[PDB]
Amino acid sequence: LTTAEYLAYQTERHVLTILTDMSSYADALREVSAAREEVPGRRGYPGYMYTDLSTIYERAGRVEGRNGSITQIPILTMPNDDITHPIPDLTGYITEGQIFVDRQLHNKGIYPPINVLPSLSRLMKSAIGEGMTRKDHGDVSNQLYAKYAIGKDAAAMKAVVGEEALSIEDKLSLEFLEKFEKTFITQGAYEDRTVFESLDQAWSLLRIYPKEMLNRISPKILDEFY
Amino acid sequence: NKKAVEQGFNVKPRLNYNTVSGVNGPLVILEKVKFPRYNEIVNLTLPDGTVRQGQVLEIRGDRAIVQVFEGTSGIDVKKTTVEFTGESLRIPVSEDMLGRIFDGSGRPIDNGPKVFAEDYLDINGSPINPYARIYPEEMISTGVSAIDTMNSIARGQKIPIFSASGLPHNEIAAQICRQAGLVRPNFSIVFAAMGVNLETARFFKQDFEENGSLERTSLFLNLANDPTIERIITPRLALTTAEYLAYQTERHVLTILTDMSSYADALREVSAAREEVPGRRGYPGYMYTDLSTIYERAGRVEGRNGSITQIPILTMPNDDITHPIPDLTGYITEGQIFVDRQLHNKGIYPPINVLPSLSRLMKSAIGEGMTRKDHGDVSNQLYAKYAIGKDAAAMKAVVGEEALSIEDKLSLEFLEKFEKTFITQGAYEDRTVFESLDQAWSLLRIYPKEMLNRISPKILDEFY
Amino acid sequence: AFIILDEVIKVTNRRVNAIEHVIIPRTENTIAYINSELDELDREEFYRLKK
Amino acid sequence: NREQVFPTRMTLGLMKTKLKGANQGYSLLKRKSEALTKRFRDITKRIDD
Amino acid sequence: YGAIYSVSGPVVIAENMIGCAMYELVKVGHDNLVGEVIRIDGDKATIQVYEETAGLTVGDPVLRTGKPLSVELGPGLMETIYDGIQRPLKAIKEESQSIYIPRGIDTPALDRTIKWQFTPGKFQVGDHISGGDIYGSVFENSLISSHKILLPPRSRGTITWIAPAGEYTLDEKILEVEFDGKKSDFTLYHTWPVRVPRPVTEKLSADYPLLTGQRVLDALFPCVQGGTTCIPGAFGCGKTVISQSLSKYSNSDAIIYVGCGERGNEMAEVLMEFPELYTEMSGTKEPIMKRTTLVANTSNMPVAAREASIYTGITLAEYFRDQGKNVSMIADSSSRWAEALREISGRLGEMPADQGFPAYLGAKLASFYERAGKAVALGSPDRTGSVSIVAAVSPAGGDFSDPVTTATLGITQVFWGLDKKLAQRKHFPSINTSVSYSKYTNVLNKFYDSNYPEFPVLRDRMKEILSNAEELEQVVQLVGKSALSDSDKITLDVATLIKEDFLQQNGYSTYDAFCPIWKTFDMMRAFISYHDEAQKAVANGANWSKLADSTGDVKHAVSSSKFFEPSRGEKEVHGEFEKLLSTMQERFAEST
Amino acid sequence: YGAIYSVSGPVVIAENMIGCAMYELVKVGHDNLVGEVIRIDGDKATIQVYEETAGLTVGDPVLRTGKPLSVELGPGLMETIYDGIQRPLKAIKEESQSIYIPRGIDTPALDRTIKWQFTPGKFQVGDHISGGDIYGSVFENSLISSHKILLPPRSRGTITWIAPAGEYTLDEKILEVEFDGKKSDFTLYHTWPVRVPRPVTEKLSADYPLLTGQRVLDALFPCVQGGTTCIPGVISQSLSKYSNSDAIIYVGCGERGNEMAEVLMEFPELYTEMSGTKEPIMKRTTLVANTSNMPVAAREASIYTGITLAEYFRDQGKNVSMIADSSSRWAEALREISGRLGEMPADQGFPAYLGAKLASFYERAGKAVALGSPDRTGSVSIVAAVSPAGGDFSDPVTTATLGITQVFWGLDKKLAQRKHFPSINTSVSYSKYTNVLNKFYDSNYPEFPVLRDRMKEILSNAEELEQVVQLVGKSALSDSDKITLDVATLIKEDFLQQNGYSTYDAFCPIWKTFDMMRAFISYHDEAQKAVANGANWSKLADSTGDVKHAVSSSKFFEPSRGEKEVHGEFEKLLSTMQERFAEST
Ligand SMILES: Nc1ncnc2c1ncn2[C@@H]1O[C@H](COP(=O)(O)OP(=O)(O)OP(=O)(O)O)[C@@H](O)[C@H]1O
Ligand SMILES: [Mg+2]
């Protein structure tokens, strides 16, 4: 973070630090705290872990005077895959948004095992704008999230009510879920997808629907892109 | 006549300690103390001139550990002077206290003069001799059908009120105060506020003024603004006042201890300030003993006509009986009046849930001479059939209304007409215990005579 | 077919009502009790470490 | 009104999984009931005809 | 004489006391407060004073008595109430003229002015008397007559002189025993340390049942005379009422009712009601109060005195056991004793162990519960007594996972669990028939085969009916009752009837205040015969709905059998019950 | 000046330091770091330094301020952004010319260089003066005029010398008060301990309503001036401008730094959309902004500093609405301080005093007559965003907030997903101030409580009808139930879904809200009468489609005209609806 602060603010460049194993950092903080004869907090971790993680995280951000920026992707390792764990809880409190990697997705397929239902970005609306990237980004992403949720619901409902009894909007949603978890999310470890190419692929998946089915997308965007 | 006055004419100089070995949290430690007592109240004079009042809690050799009631903020080692009164905290008690409004520490906030003390009584008091304590066996017609037919309250009972944060416990407790009276022919209410908000305190004051009870009430208001350490002594002051007014003045006394959850929260804060045991849910291991010191000061005594009835008002955090405060309070007290959030949301006033409610002084004071001879059997049958109705309602929710049998349908009808007509009652309407028993008998007459297995057959033949 | 569908729908609705009203309060209360109990154990350990 | 489960971290996780499965089954069975109710209304109309 | 060094709560670390023994009784303060030494750190000696510590100054004298906390056994205990350290509350009230208990009152534990008729025993001058031998008896009251005077344990020698028959006070000499050339003078009373159990010749396997008087306790989960009993349950479950009913209507010769942490109003209720009640024992109607003493240490009394109250009560029970009587101690809250222990431990600074209760809590509970048991008295003449400890545990939060409850279940033999669901809805006794157990059902087969041979079989049949109905209710509550078989419906109906009529007992109603063993056995026979007749009639082909419609009268007669007052006698009540079964059998054959 | 004796994390022990009051702020180190004394053991006094404690050496002087954590009350607060402990971030940036906050920066919380036009009050030399008595006035800003200067509440004595009118610097002495020695000189500003509440002559019942502008919050769940309010956390912007409070104390900015930047940018950019043509919103709102990077003590004391500022503005007679945000972040900071202090956890790791501190903080709010002459009345409305932890109302902080706060507005996630605004869940939200507000409603708008109760009953019946339509066929419902459901749907579409973006319904006033309430009540009564008369529901709907359209357009009617023009339009609409309903029969 000191190197990022230097580069971004005294050099006017964008950084995007990627801190790995915040769980390992928290364990290191645990050992440093307990070496000073201090009682452990809730889950053994020091009570001031919130303050320390707040310093480490909030060391990032944009400033008015300088043209640089410090984005941050602190990559945690949730013990026992528990969100109620102190490190995930404090990180969710301090940071804005969260990206989840799913064990079910990892078992089912290949990189990246990221599920979109529990993963969201709080300042997404600012990044996905009109002048920056494309004007259809927000509508496409919202539509994809809604149809992925409906696809998961239909996949659960198929084994309950039979495949035939599913509605048209459920069969199409199941097909979209298959082509989504298998072609859109599924990305090679070395292949690079620009934002525009990713949006084009998202539209390619979204075109299996009738134009009336896509409800979250604005009518102008539907007329121009679909 | 009274020889306790002669001991008053004795001036006793008190040491002024400028020695403060250190202050940590709400405790200030003194050094070089000449023969400290164990609960003597001391007057800390801060450098700014404001005088806090504290009491010692642990006294090693030439060392005393004072906790101040108004917090330790602003205490300096060099300039604070501590004056050792040499006696434990002693509220000045007089019969003229009836009609006054005091503060959390006993200071009069009524803009009047200091109480012309008739005797100084220690706030901690002393346990009442069980041989010298009479069993309270005189019913109190609280007007409320639930508290008069199913949870009848004796003269010396200490039955509290269990409720959640938003429930109208204050509205019910004010109804009891204005309607408290013996079934077979005025109470001197003593009101203690511990951490209640200004709206609640003003509501109680205005209700007492409106009903005219303010001429017989000595309010001890300790609002949320008041320091959090003197919530401990406020109920002690109220109970000392009630103990005087009953056992030495021959007055039947109601003692209202509102926000005992706030009192226990203050107790937990005091305990966690020291290195005390955490008990359950963080509350001190001696919380049972402290709550007992509070509650057990009620009751009637032999040879003295005065009686004290305690109606503490609790605030269950999650409306859970399993919480330490309601659990220990129901363990110590002689019952409880459970105010139901479910009934309140349904629209019933009073929203008293009788199933968690209990009155241990009902066995006596319910009979063939104090109330009607059918009272106990009627109440037992009402609990049985109301619980059966609640179980039938749960079964209705689970497997539809059609699956219920004739008994379950009758139970549902009885529960509807019981919650809607019997428990439900106007805020200013009082019902005689006999009228409430007649309504209960109508509700039982919903059922056929055969299904009433809790009514003794003689009573069933005579009253059906 | 109508009679069989009526029986199946009745059984399913009874199952949904049972699941919700019984299980979800039951499992939620069990979760709350377990959280409280582990909180108490953590508090006892904290007190022992403070001593 | 609580399951007789010994308080433990493994027990807590098992009960969270049970709660998630119970909610999923509740939603799925309610949707199945709605579908079967639509089919039953259609069957009743066809039976009258 | 030492000095006080530190006063923090109910513990007083007193300095300048080199030579103080562990658990040695002291007198802390100018008012001579009663305290016991816990730790001895050099000349310092931490003391748990059994009174109020408010007002103790640093420097107050502390006397060393030299002897442990010693109860004062002897005549005059039977009809009294004690303060935990064996201070007669009546004497305190009469001496103080105040409704309070003054700090430091040193009234004698036993009335010294009262003159007791003394009848010398078979021993005379020259007979070698041993510890625990009976050298005389005194007439205490009409019920407890011949309050046998026992030679103190560990006291032995040849009788030099014995007091002739007459009237004596406690301070007057009664006996002189010569041991190794040193004469020892013995009075009517004698002291005994409460910590050490009174010795017995040899304990015996308890076999006679303790007839509680409650239907479920006496039938489903019986307790023997001489066995520990546990009654957990949240507030309002019925532990105090069960204890009081057991003390009122038990077959025990004497009661030691110990209240630690219990309200003063319960003590007032006992003092007010026990003299009113009467017992049919000893061939005459005498008040219950004449054979029950109360150790009253309420919740607002000093914390440290709850342990002293428990130990004083158990030692009084052990004394009346050594007298050859069938005593039953009733500790009102072992949980409150444990909470007192936790408060003392936290004030001292020991390691909290589990929940804050001290690590020695399990051992202390085990020792206290091991004090009980049927035993042969120490000395000749041979006589056998028993102490049944029926202590009501009070779990925190109404959960049976508390450390006190777990230790008590581990050490005791009978567990009468109470469910708050049945505590509400007025279903007392609120006994949880699923978790409750009694381990004396095996040994009680001798008594059952001797008196009521069908009692164990009927109890087992009722238990299995209750278990089947519990399973049926569990499955029905989630899957409805539209698929049950006729046998399942019969089981559910009969078990609901059992819960509504048999298991539930209104202890405050004249008919159900005391259901004796014969009435309970007859009603079990009635209910089991009803269930068997219904099962046989339905298996014959009769529809259960029509059978219930036709036999509603028989069902009402069975369910109303509790109203038969036991005061009519065994012959009258059993005569009505025999007609009840005969009519029920006829009304099940005519209907079928 | 003492000396540092021990440093172990942010726990500095200073020796040879005798005379340090409890909780007294000190200047730790050579860089003038600020820290509070948390315990004293004689000469040694343990200090929790607010900023980073790295680099502190043994023997570093520890200066003594002599006062506890205090807020510099006085002119110059209104248009300023502050930190948790009132660090003037704007002036700090201007002086340092850097994006960082230098450690131990000593920029005064109030601009000492600006000149204030002081006008002496009625008090003259030689007159006895009491705490809180107004002895002058200062023109601070256009939106906030007559910044009345108050004597410090603890101060007492007689006036010895008062400066005449003119432009005075904030550090120049303005008044000398003698009390057993003229040892008191008072400038335009005074410091007040932040934890210690500002005294008042008498706290009064909160009766006058808080007009939030939103129709839902002003009709179904009203709040009173001087009353506490709860929000799960559009509402914040509405209270900032549309509220009739004469001042605003925003103590939010959230835990996220991006949220703080967005709030700071939005507050200065937004103008007075309420009454006042040309006036910035920031001209009356002080921003106590604290990010997670800020010291934990500052994060915990942000709300206390804000409430003390609000009580200072109340002591001048101004109605103040202190919008509090990120109360979950404040609770996290309090828990962090508790864990640092080793305080025993009480519930879910939170300290034992959380409920007590929250209750005292909310009891700070209330309508009260200000201390000292002239007799004047002020109010401190608190609107604290509860911010439930983990999306559930199970946190102890959330439970305490719902227990002490009197109004819960209950923003609904499902309603927000339904694109509804303000998306307040009518089934969960509540307001305990209706009983008190009945007095003002009888005084001004008599039928408003009856209409509100009618809509509450209508909403309950609508929920019942929705449950019935979910269970069985919708057509199986009765005509009255269908009419009630349609009326409730229209109410939710027009009355409640009034978006603030459009200028037509940006801020519905109380008179427009009452007109809409009367129109809806009249429509419901006419529908019920038509149903009772036996007319078909479909025919009645076909005939009264015009009336329904008029009722819907009543919400869209511009409130700019106001006065009787809006009232006259409602009367014509009500008369037309009655005539149309009668004609249909
Ligand atoms: N066998 C019974 N018959 C009739 N009523 C009973 C019976 N047992 C209990 N009750 C009723 O229920 C109440 C329960 O009070 P009880 O003294 O038994 O409580 P407890 O469980 O011992 O409480 P605590 O733990 O506070 O001492 C009694 O006061 C009485 O009203
Ligand atoms: Mg009891």
To test the contact with chain D by mutation, choose from A157, A168, A171 the residue with the greatest count of D C-beta atoms within 10 A, namely A157
Other beta carbons within 10 angstroms of residue F308's beta carbon come to: 26
Q: B and F: touch, per 3+ CB pairs < 8 A?
A: yes
- Interchain contact D43–A (C-beta under 8 A): no
Q: Residue B395 is which amino acid?
A: M
In this complex, which of E99, E299, E478 lies closest to B247 when CB atoms are compared? E99
Nearest residue CA, atom 31 of ligand 1? B360
Q: What is the DSSP letter of E145?
A: -
Asked if F81 and F89 touch (Cβ cutoff 8 Å), the reply is yes
User: Measuring CA to CA, which residue among B155, B411, B192 is closest to residue B312?
Assistant: B192
Nearest to A65 by CA among F254, F87, F93: F93
Is residue B305 classed as helix, strand or coil in its secondary structure?
Answer: strand
| Interchain pair F256, A94: CB under 8 A | yes
Q: Look at strands F157-162 and F81-82 and give their pairing.
A: unpaired
The DSSP call for residue E104 is: T
E434's tokens: 């699923």
Q: Checking DSSP bridges between strand E157-162 and strand E175-179, what pairing results, if any?
A: antiparallel
> How many other CB atoms are found less than 10 A from the CB of residue F482?
19
* In C1-51, beta strands by DSSP E: none
Residues facing residue E560 across a β-bridge: none
The secondary element (H helix, E strand) that includes residue F73 is strand F70-73
Q: B252-262 as b/e, with b when 16 or more CB fall inside 10 Å?
A: bbbbbbbbbbb
F137 DSSP assignment: E
Q: How was this structure determined?
A: cryo-EM
What contacts F511, CB < 8 A, 6 or more positions away? F445, F562, F566, F567
DSSP state of B104: T
CA distances from residue B32 to B52, B60, B266, E465, F206 in whole angstroms, order as listed: 21, 10, 30, 74, 51
Query: Is the CB of D1 less than 8 angstroms away from the CB of C15?
Result: no
Count other Cβ atoms within 10 Å, centred on residue A221.
19
- Cβ contact A160–D29 (<8 Å): yes
Closest residue in chain E to residue B456, using alpha carbons only: E563
Q: How many CB atoms lie within 10 A of CB E333?
A: 27
Answer whether E233 contacts ligand 1 (Cβ < 6 A).
yes
Return d(Cα E112, Cα E125) in angstroms, integer: 26
Ligand 1 contacts CB of residue E259 (under 6 A): no
Q: In terms of Cα–Cα distance, which of F433, F492, F434 is closest to F463?
A: F492
E424 CB within 6 A, ligand 1 = no
How many whole angstroms from its chain centre is CA A77? 15
**Cβ within 8 Å of residue C47, ≥6 positions away:** B277, B278, E352, E356, F344
Nearest to E532 by CA among E458, E591, E475: E458
| Sign for the pseudo-dihedral over CA of E517, E518, E519, E522 | positive
DSSP B392-447: HHHHHHHHTTTT--HHHHHHHHHHHHHIIIII---TT----HHHHHHHHHHHHHHS
Tell me the CA–centroid distance for residue E217 and ligand 2, in Å. Answer: 17
Q: Ligand 1: does its nearest atom lie under 6 Å from the Cβ of E514?
A: no
Q: Which residue(s) pair with E191 in the sheet?
A: E72
For the beta carbon of residue B32, count every other beta carbon within 10 angstroms: 11
Of C47, F348, F340, D11, whose CA–CA distance to A84 is shortest? F348
**F308: contact with A, CB 8 A cutoff:** no
> Would you list the DSSP string of B231-271?
TTHHHHHHHHHHHHHHHTT--EEEEEEE-HHHHHHHHHHHH
Contact predicate E47/E14, CB 8 Å: yes
Could you tell me if E375 and E202 are in contact, meaning their C-beta atoms sit under 8 angstroms apart? Answer: yes
Ligand 2 center–CA E333 separation, angstroms: 7
Give the C-alpha separation, E387 to E327, whole Å.
Answer: 5
Task: Give nearest CA residue, ligand 1 atom 11.
Answer: E238
CB E321 within 8 A of CB E387: yes
- CA angle E54-E59-E65, nearest 5°? 85
Paired with F4 in beta bridges are F14
> Shortest CA distance to E7 belongs to which of E51, E61, E57?
E57
DSSP 3-state of E176: strand
Helices (H), ranges, B108-220: 145, 169-179, 198-211
Tell me which residue of E32, E90, E31, E37 sits closest to E66, measured CA to CA: E37
Q: Is E241 in the pocket of ligand 1 (CB under 6 A)?
A: yes
- Our CA angle for E273, E275, E276, nearest 5°, is 65
**Strand residues in F195-331 grouped as ranges (E):** 200-203, 209-210, 223-224, 228-231, 247-250, 285-288, 319-324
Distance CA A169, CA B294 (A): 66
Q: Using CB atoms within 10 Å of the CB of residue D20, give its burial: 0 to 12 exposed, 13 to 18 middle, 19+ buried.
A: exposed
Structural domain boundaries of chain F? 1-69, 70-113+187-431, 114-186, 432-585
Strand F319-324 and strand F377-385: pairing? Answer: parallel
3-state SS, E345-376, equals HHHHCCCCCECCECCCHHHHHHHHHHCCCCEE
Q: Which of residues 26-45 of C touch D (CB under 8 A)?
A: 26-35, 37-38, 41
CB of E148 shorter than 6 A to ligand 1: no
DSSP codes, B47-79: TTS-EEEEEEEEEETTEEEEEETT-STT--TTT
Neighbouring C-alpha atoms within 13 Å toward the C-beta of F421: 13
CA distance B360 to B157: 8
CB B241 within 8 A of CB B249: no
Query: Whole-angstrom Cα distance, residue F72 to residue F25?
Result: 14
CA F321 to chain CA centroid, nearest Å: 4
Atom 26, ligand 1: residue with shortest CA distance: B331
Q: What is the resolution of this structure in A?
A: 3.3
**C-alpha distances in angstroms, F280 versus A73, E36, F91, F270, F277?**
37, 75, 20, 7, 9
Q: Which residues of A46-62 are buried (b: 16+ CB within 10 A; e: fewer)?
A: bbbbbbbbbbbbbbbbb
Q: What is the dihedral of CA F411, F413, F419, F424, to 10 degrees?
A: -20
Give every CB contact of residue E570 below 8 A, 6+ residues apart in sequence. E516, E518
Query: Residues B374, B376, B382, CA angle at the centre, nearest 5°?
Result: 95
d(CA A45, CA A42): 7
**Residue matched to tokens 């003037």:** F88
DSSP string, E38-49: EE--TT-EEEEE
Distance (Å, rounded) from C-alpha F50 to C-alpha F56? 13
- Touch C-A: 3+ C-beta pairs under 8 A: yes
Of chain C, the end-to-end C-alpha distance in Å amounts to 72
Q: Do A157 and D24 make contact, defined as CB atoms within 8 angstroms?
A: no
Contacts of E479 in chain C (CB under 8 A): 14, 18
| A112: preceding bond cis by omega (within 30 degrees) | yes
Half-sphere exposure (Cβ direction) of A58: Cα atoms closer than 13 Å: 24
Closest CA to E36 of E67, E1, E59: E67
Q: How far apart are CA B281 and CA B268, in angstroms?
A: 10
Pocket test for ligand 1, best of E240, E273, E504 (most atoms within 8 A of CB): E240
Residues 6+ apart with CB under 8 A from E321: E198, E200, E327, E375, E377, E385, E386, E387
E264 lines ligand 1 (CB under 6 A): no
Residues β-bridged to residue B189: B254
Nearest CA in chain A to D16: A82
Q: What are phi and psi of D3, to 5 degrees?
A: -70, 145
Cα separation, E532 vs E462, whole angstroms:
11
Q: What is the CA radius of gyration of chain E?
A: 27
Q: What is the dihedral of CA A150, A151, A157, A159, to 10 degrees?
A: 180
